[PDB]
Design a protein around this ligand. Structure first.
Ligand code: NA
Ligand code: NA
Ligand code: NA
Ligand code: NA
Lengths: 100, 100
């Protein structure tokens, strides 16, 4: 996976955004950016790649009126029960669900 | 923050997606969805809210050709040095930077 740096140049980071100028298949280049804020996490002082839950969890369900429940895989490899209250961060903003 | 469930109904979870029918300011309702995959993480079997790095880190820089370096806050409250190789997951796809 990855390996952008091998065929890109003029790379820069500002805040959470990576910008680089990269080779196209046909020759020539294109400059683009990617905002990494939501794809890199800071965990106890260490930068980590994301741990999106669907890649580690099964049997997602709504529990009650606001809880997301699932069975998720531990580092040891077993699935354990877990839940999280969606009311912590999901808001009704004038009729539309939004994260805050 | 959050609290959608207080003024929404007919909520459902399928996979990583929450769907609900929520009250608008003017009365009446709107049905919407939100894909939580990238806003909820699975960490060692436990669902957690995101830890986007910019909310915990300072002095982001490009180190060399492909590393993101920063100083990030530990649970204890001190900033420590950390880095992550963007080549792990950022690809040049025909001239455009993409996460994979
Ligand atoms: Na690829
Ligand atoms: Na499943
Ligand atoms: Na709000
Ligand atoms: Na800063």
């Amino acid at each position: 996976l990855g390996k952008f740096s091998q065929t890109c140049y003029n790379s820069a980071i500002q805040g959470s955004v990576l910008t680089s100028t990269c080779e196209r298949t046909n020759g020539g280049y294109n400059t683009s950016s990617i905002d990494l804020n939501s794809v890199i996490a800071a965990v106890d002082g260490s930068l980590k790649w994301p741990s999106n839950f669907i890649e580690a969890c099964r049997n997602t369900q709504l529990a009650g009126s606001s809880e997301l429940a699932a069975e998720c895989k531990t580092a040891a490899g077993q699935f354990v029960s877990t839940k999280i209250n969606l009311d912590d961060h999901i808001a009704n903003i004038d009729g539309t669900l939004k994260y805050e």
